[PDB]
């Protein structure tokens, strides 16, 4: 009975974990921030309409410039826009048309991409020949690339649908570390501001806190009822949001090691598919399947505004690194830039 | 605008033109999602008609693209919405596994799940009932009644095969939006691809007459 006793020990130890994280939960975050004055109503006007794609755009990532963004659609091409003038600076034809993710390097030299082809292909923008060229094809995943995030021009963490996150080395093209704790397709991914440890949300309805250097699940955050399709760190780095198919966002704290509050509403029943905090982290952006975005007061859980501009469900959503604009991107093949 | 901003806008317009031309060139190829039960006769129909696997073949000035996706072991509900707006869904069912473990009921489950999906509410299904020549003799030894106990018919091929066809064509719940084109995969030169071509031109004609606002 060395299996049954071990499973029973696992259950008792999970009960201990729940008892511990219950013992240090005295005041609900909502109750502490009851006296904070609200942010009123936040009215955002679509400034730009980046209109080039001919299919459902699946991902989008701002450059650290806060001016260049890259959007990847399923027409088989990802475009690099100049957001300030709505100009296209590059149009990169992909080998595989099926794309679920897209990342822009923090330096701005490289752009990663991946989808149902299981390969995270990295493109070299700043070349001597003036044409965007495929640098590497990071193969080794057995699922499908659900998210990619650049650490440096050398390292990249990838989130596949084979229940494993992997840290790559672009030059060698081999996996450095394989993070394997999930029991469901890992749908989203978010780097800490310092890139010392990241967090991944899986179809297991549980987010996990990984360490990039060790490769060990530090903490596991449960609470969601369905697949979690979006993760984003709080700008502090000691909290992250989690969008699920429950149509609820939850803000977990890393130090408290539990959820603080939930961003639910009665007439919201469509599964959220993208989250992002503002620069200060006060208002939490949230991209629903209602074909509109929402703006939650991330300290009070009361809704502040609605970015309703899209004819189809918003896939991608990103706040600029200077917190100047958000860029929603939906299946109507348009991605607006609100402000 | 300045001397460089004008040249940047010119580049933007030129790559936008190339993007539009690539879009209108790639939007004229008919796309077909290739589904089927685990270890069905997918190999036979993918080899006769010529991660994710894409096979591009042409037949009578019509360029087909079949996306054999069944090689992917993950949550099918998490990437199946990528294949909405596909022309047809080629769904091959190994007719010879009516008894093996059952597997026919599992293929029925998959068909019922994908035919009545949110995304494929209007995309016509081209159901292939392959491995006909084995099923021909297999029923004479093993009765079909073990798979369908509510089947009171002759233990012969032409009735049993027609019963399986009727049981599959029953599972669709919207018989007005979407059609189901069934074929019994034959070893004849080009009859399989001919049937695919016929079904695809049919759905294309219906889509075009809908686009004219005339149907």
């Amino acid at each position: 009975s060395e299996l049954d006793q071990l499973r029973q020990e696992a259950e008792q130890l999970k009960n201990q974990i729940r008892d511990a994280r219950k013992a240090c939960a005295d005041a609900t975050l909502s109750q502490i921030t009851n006296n904070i004055d609200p942010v009123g109503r936040i009215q955002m006007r679509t400034r730009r309409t980046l209109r080039g794609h001919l299919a459902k755009i699946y991902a989008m990532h701002w450059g650290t410039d806060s001016r260049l963004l890259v959007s990847a659609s399923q027409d088989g091409k990802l475009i690099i826009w100049d957001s300030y003038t709505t100009n296209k600076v590059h149009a990169i034809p992909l080998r595989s048309s099926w794309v679920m993710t897209c990342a822009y390097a923090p330096s701005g030299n490289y752009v990663a991409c991946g989808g149902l082809d299981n390969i995270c292909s990295i493109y070299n923008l700043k070349t001597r020949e003036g044409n965007v060229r495929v640098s590497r094809e990071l193969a080794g995943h057995t699922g499908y690339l659900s998210c990619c995030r650049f650490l440096d021009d050398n390292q990249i963490v990838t989130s596949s649908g084979d229940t494993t996150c992997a840290l790559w080395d672009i030059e060698t093209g081999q996996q450095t570390t394989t993070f394997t704790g999930h029991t469901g397709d890992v749908m989203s991914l978010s780097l800490a501001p310092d890139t010392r440890l990241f967090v991944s949300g899986a179809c297991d309805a549980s987010a996990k806190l990984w360490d990039v250097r060790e490769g060990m699940c530090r903490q596991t955050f449960t609470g969601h009822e369905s697949d979690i399709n979006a993760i984003c760190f709080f700008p502090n780095g000691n909290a992250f949001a989690t969008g699920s198919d429950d149509a609820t966002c939850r803000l977990f704290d890393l130090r408290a090691d539990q959820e603080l509050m939930t961003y639910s509403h009665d007439n919201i029943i469509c599964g959220i598919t993208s989250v992002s905090f503002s620069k200060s982290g006060r208002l939490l952006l949230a991209g629903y399947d209602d074909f509109n975005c929402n703006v939650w007061d991330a300290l009070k859980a009361d809704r502040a505004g609605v970015l309703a501009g899209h004819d189809n469900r918003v896939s991608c959503l990103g706040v600029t690194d200077d917190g100047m604009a958000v860029a929603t991107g939906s299946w109507d093949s348009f991605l607006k830039i609100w402000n | 605008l300045s001397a460089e901003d004008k040249a940047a806008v010119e580049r933007s317009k030129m790559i936008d033109r190339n993007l539009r031309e690539d879009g209108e060139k790639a939007a004229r190829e008919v796309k077909l999602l290739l589904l089927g039960a685990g270890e069905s006769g997918k190999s036979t129909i993918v080899k006769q008609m010529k991660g994710i696997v894409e096979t591009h073949f042409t037949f009578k000035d019509l360029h087909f693209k079949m996306f054999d996706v069944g090689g992917q072991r993950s949550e099918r509900k998490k990437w199946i919405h990528c294949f909405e707006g596909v022309t047809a869904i080629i769904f091959c069912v190994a007719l010879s596994d009516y008894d093996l473990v059952n597997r026919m009921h599992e293929s029925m489950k998959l068909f019922d799940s994908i035919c009545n999906n949110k995304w494929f509410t209007d995309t016509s299904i081209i159901l292939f009932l392959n491995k006909k020549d084995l099923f021909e003799e297999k029923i004479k030894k093993s009765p079909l009644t073990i798979c369908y106990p509510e089947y009171a018919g002759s233990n012969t091929y032409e009735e049993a095969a027609a019963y399986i066809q009727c049981q599959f064509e029953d599972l669709n719940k919207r018989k007005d939006t979407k059609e189901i084109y069934t074929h019994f995969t034959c070893a004849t030169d080009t009859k399989n691809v001919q049937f695919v071509f016929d079904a695809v031109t049919d759905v294309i004609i219906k889509n075009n007459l809908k686009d004219c606002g005339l149907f």
């Epitope: 003038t85 600076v89 701005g108 020949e129 044409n131 | 300045s2 460089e4 040249a7 580049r11 030129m14």
Partner: single-chain antibody, 232 residues
């Protein structure tokens, strides 16, 4: 390995015709807006003509307008300058210069080797100093003032610094008076404001000697400086 090779130079009789061919090999030629700039036998550089990517935009210098015709064959990777009725003021070495224009691009980055052709309102860039001797290891400061303000409304201040070493083709050093060109050491630093600009070189070595040209890119006559020459 990008290379621009000009061919079609030689001695021509005045009022004749000639065609120069710049055969590009080693980059996406179809994506690059290509220029022609000439240099009189002992004078500074001078812009001649420009044809954008897809041939959709052309300009000419007022001196060579009507007489010269620029054209490119993108499939064959060749740039032409069909020049007619050659005057005694066209005896100059002609460079074909690639330039790509998008947000953050470095136009005029690579220059052709140059072909020798011999025959038998706009902005003015003033390089006050025309000669300054210098010893290696020191810090040198080259100045260039414009007439019109090159600081555009969008924030970009379009001024380029080129260096032409003896018996060479000029190479891009700094684009928009701040940004260092790719493969240039961090000794060169661009600074200044509208109608006042300065290229400072810290720890000068025996490779920086030559002529430093000051080009504006605000509007499309492209006017170079007279050129500051470094000696020892």
């Amino acid at each position: 390995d990008v290379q621009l090779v000009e061919s079609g130079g030689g001695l021509v009789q005045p009022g004749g015709s000639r065609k120069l061919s710049c055969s590009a090999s080693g980059f996406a030629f179809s994506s690059f807006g290509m220029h022609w700039v000439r240099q009189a036998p002992e004078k500074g550089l001078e812009w001649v003509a420009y044809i954008s990517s897809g041939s959709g935009t052309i300009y000419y210098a007022d001196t060579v307008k009507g007489r010269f015709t620029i054209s490119r064959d993108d499939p064959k990777n060749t740039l032409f300058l069909q020049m007619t009725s050659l005057r005694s003021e066209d005896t100059a070495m002609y460079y074909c210069v690639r330039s790509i224009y998008y947000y953050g691009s470095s136009p005029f980055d690579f220059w052709g080797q140059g072909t020798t052709l011999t025959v038998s309102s706009d902005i003015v860039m003033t390089q006050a100093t025309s000669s300054v001797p210098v010893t290696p290891g020191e810090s040198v400061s080259i100045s260039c003032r414009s007439s019109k303000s090159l600081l555009h409304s969008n924030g970009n201040t379009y001024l380029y610094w080129f260096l032409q070493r003896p018996g060479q083709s000029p190479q891009l050093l700094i684009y928009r008076m701040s940004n260092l060109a790719s493969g240039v050491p961090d000794r060169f630093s661009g600074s200044g404001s509208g109608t006042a600009f300065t290229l400072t070189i810290s720890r000068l070595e025996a490779e920086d000697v030559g002529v430093y040209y000051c080009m504006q890119h605000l509007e499309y006559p492209l006017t170079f400086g007279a050129g500051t020459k470094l000696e020892l």
